[PDB]
């Protein structure tokens, strides 16, 4: 049925399990449904025919997704902006989206936006207020009608795209029901999309986990030991984070079962130490733009891809759309030659808000990735060492970040000065490796170091 009707479902079905917790803030299917519904209502009666996008600010509290719902039930977008975004930034979007409202799930501190601001105590009023009552069901966001703009440039996901993805997630990567989700990308993040939907579509729960925990190891593992998280959704720098601790295993988490990973490279020796780790789970690496709704490529790690390639694979195509690797010309690369990795079909954006990249492919929209890769018999590789670099000894995690930079985190070794390691280490690489392919410059931490969303902080490296 539709994505609203499938999600509705769940709140008649199972109306009192959670649909989303934070924390010790909770809300079940049926809580969701009816403060959606209210805020809905109350959005319809103040903009009658306004159908502006609407920003929903915050970080992880249960009103975020229940702001979500209810801005789309009313006919309009909504546009996530979390705690961890530019004060600057919140204000760019505030006057390039052209936004006339903001739902705050806490204290909006970004202050003066020229936008009708709507604050946590002013929000629950509304819930209140509208309390019963539902919206016109003509008003939901339908057909090519934006559902989310997600800044990277706002991004237009809508009710199509979202749909085209949410069906293949939940149905190539085998999601049952019922099963709780992990959420730690912030909602800024489209990575949060593959966790939000599939859950919400399947009557699941979404286990969010926050900023201050990733902070602060012993609450987060504190958190997941609970959690009982079935399938997780995250950044392979996340997983690989949790991974330093040796007690995150199948003990930890005893029914995990799907580890779902997109927006950057998954490490062959990541997946190795998962598989090892959580013999019952089924690990699954994607790849997409945000311009093409979270992802469109997929493929199930095994051990045997673990065997065959050193750099992991990022996948197949889902089948409404499709994969074109441009050499420089509009002339299509040979298989298995790189050139730019291009994606047509319903998954791809309508465009940016306001406002190269957007084009169409026999009658399709189209669009440019700005990303290198090549297809071999239908799987895509994307290219932006390092893997050579972590299978060192003395290696525990290891990133290459060009300038070419090796950033390492050590495990136990015996020198005594830096540069005795870094020869040591050189030394082993030129044994795969040619030597001008080995970094000249090692720098090493104790932690590769993550952005609010998840993703190696290049910038911060960079800087030291």
Known sequence: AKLLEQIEKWAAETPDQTAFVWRDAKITYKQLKEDSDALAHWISSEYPDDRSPIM???????????????????????????????????????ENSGAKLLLSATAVTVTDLPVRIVSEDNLKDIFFTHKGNTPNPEHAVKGDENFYIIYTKGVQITYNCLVSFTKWAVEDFNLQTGQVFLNQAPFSFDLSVMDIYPSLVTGGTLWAIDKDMIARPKDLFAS??????????????????????????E???????????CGEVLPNEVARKLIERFPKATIMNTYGPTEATVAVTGIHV????????????????????????????????PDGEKGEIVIVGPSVSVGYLGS????????????????????????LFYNGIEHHLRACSYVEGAVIVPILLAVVVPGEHSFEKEFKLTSAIKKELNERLPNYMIPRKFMYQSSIPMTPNGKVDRKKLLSE
């Open 56 to 94: 929903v600010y915050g970080h992880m509290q249960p009103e975020m997704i229940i702001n979500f719902l209810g801005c789309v039930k009313a006919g309009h977008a909504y546009i996530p902006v979390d705690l961890s975004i530019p004060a600057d930034r919140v204000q760019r979007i505030a």
């Open 302 to 333: 095994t051990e045997e891809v673990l065997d065959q390639y050193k750099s992991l694979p990022v996948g197949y195509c889902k089948s409404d759309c499709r994969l074109l690797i441009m050499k420089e010309d509009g002339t299509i690369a």
């Open 251 to 261: 003990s930890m988490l005893p029914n995990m079962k799907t580890f779902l990973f």
């Open 356 to 379: 190269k990249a957007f084009t169409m492919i026999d009658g399709e929209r189209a669009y440019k990735t700005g990303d290198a890769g090549y297809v071999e018999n239908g799987l």
């Open 224 to 249: 997941l030991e609970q959690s009982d998280i079935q399938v997780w959704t995250s950044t392979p720098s996340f997983a690989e984070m949790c991974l330093m601790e040796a007690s995150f295993s």
